[PDB]
Symmetry: C3
Subunit: 392 residues, 3 copies
């Protein structure tokens, strides 16, 4: 006879964890919150900013259990980070919902380990959608809530009444770190993408259309004589880019994506930066007051990720990423006074093996690194040659 959530919580809370962290760059200790995604695999998620540069990470459950977890992919652009659990047993995944069919007035609840306070749930509603702009350079399309959030809730969950996930508590706004009743979370849908990506590549393959633009406000719609106070304005398409080929002109405006009306440029950015190269999609334009529908596909780009620190833990130096197919790891760029290179390391090299163990990708690598060889045998190859590098 008393409306409550506890009923559903019983069912959902389990699918959430309190994350405890140790790392270095000086030694540090932190904490956040994570969410089970695949019950069997033990796939938890979290704000990258909670796990960034993490040496040891342990996960604690709703029911007291402590597990050890490992990095599986970071994307500090949108601040997500998939991690996995060592020996996942008897877990509880979570159902996801469609962040897209959200409405402003719906209610939401957020759980997390704020201030190391164990499973802490709070309540609120959708304050507003598609908010962005804190760190303009990041892919942000936050949902905004009045639910109560703080240090700890980071990577925590935020669900509809049905105990279905819709976004992740990322950051809040607050002078003097304290909840004013304004929290932000990353829409489920976005996360799903960034997720299933790393799930299969240990990293993010960023698709771009190859365009420039800026927020269409009212003044602009005036100057450029169109009907639309919100939207994405096409500054200047790129040549030989998806956009180019697609047939889009500088001075056009986009009103929708895959049927989904577009609040503003910021979102559009985050929306697609989210998606994986080759991802097909359909757009609604409006050049010269005339509506347009066009199809497209994300192409390559020229991005940056995974460093010689995010895998070596200490061995600064060149950036590193996969190569061709499962053809090993390529050293992007060795610095100057960097220890990696002070091991014989030089850009362009192409690690193919180690400790009599073939390497096809960062996975097989950090995997050998896990065995923690006291002595480290690199089987790389400069130019047409074959050599080895060493370590301790």
């Amino acid at each position: 006879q008393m409306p409550s959530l506890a009923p559903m919580l019983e069912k959902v809370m389990p699918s959430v964890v309190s994350i405890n962290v140790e790392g270095s760059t000086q030694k540090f200790m932190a904490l956040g919150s994570g969410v089970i995604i695949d019950a069997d695999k033990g796939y938890v998620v979290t704000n990258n900013h909670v796990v960034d540069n993490a040496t040891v990470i342990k996960v604690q459950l709703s029911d007291g259990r402590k597990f050890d977890a490992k990095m599986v992919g970071k994307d500090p652009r949108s601040d997500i980070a998939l991690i996995q659990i060592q020996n996942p047993k008897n877990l509880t995944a979570i159902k996801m919902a469609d962040s897209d069919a959200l409405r402003v007035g719906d209610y939401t609840v957020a759980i997390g380990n704020p201030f190391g306070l164990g499973e802490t749930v709070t309540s609120g509603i959708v304050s507003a959608l598609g908010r962005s702009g804190l760190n303009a350079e990041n892919y942000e399309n936050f949902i905004q809530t009045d639910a109560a959030i703080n240090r700890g809730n980071s990577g925590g969950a935020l669900v509809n009444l049905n105990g279905e996930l819709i976004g992740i508590n990322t950051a809040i706004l607050a002078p003097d770190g304290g909840n004013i009743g304004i929290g932000f979370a990353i829409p489920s849908n976005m996360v799903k993408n960034l997720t299933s990506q790393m799930v299969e590549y240990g990293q993010v393959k960023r698709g771009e259309l190859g365009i420039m633009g800026t927020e269409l406000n009212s003044e602009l719609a005036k100057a450029m004589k169109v009907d639309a106070q919100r939207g994405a304005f096409v500054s200047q398409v790129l040549p030989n880019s998806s956009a180019a080929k697609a047939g889009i002109k500088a001075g056009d405006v986009i009103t929708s994506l895959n049927g989904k009306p577009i609040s503003s440029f910021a979102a559009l950015r985050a929306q697609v930066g989210t998606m994986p190269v080759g991802s097909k999609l359909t757009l609604g334009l409006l050049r010269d007051g005339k509506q347009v529908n066009v199809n497209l596909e994300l192409q390559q780009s020229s991005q940056n990720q995974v460093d010689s620190s995010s895998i070596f833990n200490g061995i600064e130096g060149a950036e590193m990423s996969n190569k061709g197919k499962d053809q090993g790891v390529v050293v992007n760029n060795v610095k100057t006074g960097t220890p990696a290179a002070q091991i014989g390391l030089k850009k362009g090299d192409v690690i193919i093996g180690a400790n009599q163990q073939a390497v096809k990708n960062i996975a097989e690598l950090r995997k050998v690194l896990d065995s923690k060889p006291s002595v480290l045998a690199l089987n790389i190859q400069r130019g047409d040659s074959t050599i080895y590098l060493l370590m301790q």
Copy 2:
């Protein structure tokens, strides 16, 4: 199958705006929130304190549109301020509800542009009613809510579930400007009055009964042997005042107004200061343990408003207000080292015309001021004479 507000929001949010301000007294920029009242006229409202001394004010909509607005009446006593929109097209007014039939336990939602965050809605309930006292001298009878409010929400809305208005987010309590979960808003009813007033006069015509008093607490009820721990105590009626004539004695207590029980004096004040001269009303007393019912009518007073700055924008000097019927604007009081007077201005004068354009009231005036004559031709009249004053 999921209870939500979004349904109604769809319908209401539109009737709300984000207010952006530029003024001077040194140049400044601010922001607040406003609410459409008359869909056709383009009548928005806001805390006076958000628009006070405003040079240029633009209004942005729920749907991206930007409009220009103009002052139409300020009442910094209760801090409301009606403004209108230049070229109102396709607008959305809002339905008002009866702030009087409110109850403490009802739910409420507040929207506004806090921190310039675009349409931001938050949720809560009626924390309590008839709260007052922040600035004792103001007419305050706030409703109090735990809904989330901040800089920006000022002039924002606060509605029952039905999307009917009940009060305006004015101020919150907070050390270190931040929402602790205590917000205040001015009851609809109050606002309605202050509103439809300016609607027809560009100003406020304050009625008074002509009495003095103070909060009847428990101790007092003791000393003066009555049964009532809350109420308004009649210190000393005034002679030839409504109260006088009505027949009220010093040492009486008021328990109700127009049937509406009275929490305390503070409210009673705000309640009536709210109302326009001549407004009829009925009261419930209690002199010598004996209940009383009496009728009355607000009379004149001796108040202050609309300055030579609120209309001149820069030209300090005498205060100014209407005169008799549509008989022009009267200079209340020229200071000493004030530029207005350093134009030939002197108290008692009675501007009757300007630029071959008759003037009957502040409206017709600020209206000519809008045409922004480079050179300003005043057709005033000292004593029985007729003269002109000038400007640039």
Copy 3:
């Protein structure tokens, strides 16, 4: 047609008060909130920390009435404090609910006089249960809510929708004293006990089992090869203690109390420290992976309470408590440079009478103290003798 709480509030709010305080240790003034427990007796409650060292305490009602109240028992260990009202007339008690059958997801509302703001109600849900640890030494098993709470709400109420009590707003977490959306309250059940105790003894009779232990986390369950990530670990039973007799071994873990599963040690502590000596109860163990059920009974201990200040108001010196049956008050321990002793006071003494008025317990005492004799006639007895001490 609009869901609300006001309906029930109408009925409940009355059962709550705004507490105003004057005391010394330098003169001070404070405020909190209290709750009527017994409508006829006028039994209000509050955080001890709100009333501690109180000289004069007045209570104000939901309906404006002011009453005078008196101390009736303090327990600064769990921070509750029963007080009574002088001449209780036409009061409103409150129904209590079972804090034990609570669930995390249920909604709650909290009322109180925050910042001296008169009856202020706010809303939220059960953020989480059995939280402890702020002041480890206190008996804490708080319920945690996102409802809005602040200075003033202390001793305020916190109820289920039905207007049934479930806990008392004690403290909140907050850097820069301000509600972040994290409040804590003491479960009803706990309070009931501490309550009906003082109701009949003016003090707390602490039962102990006589054991030591510490929080069973995961690591521990490893080391000691058991299945249970939460619980109370039995460090070392005491000899001739309830536990001893009961038959409990060091290295056992408790999983439940009176059927009620046990979150952690902290709770268990608060739970039982709560209860009165001789209180019977049943436990669920788990030594060597094998479940156990045992019965028990709280015994005596060696605690501390009620000082020569909490009753004398100024007369520091020895601690004081009851003795045997209604056999008067015993001086626990006189200090050195303490005024009480500088009246002829010495430990071991046994006040039996005063002003030709027999004394059997602290009650009959503070009762004579209430008559406020200008001159104070003590009828004590050192060893086998009979003497008198004096005062002014």
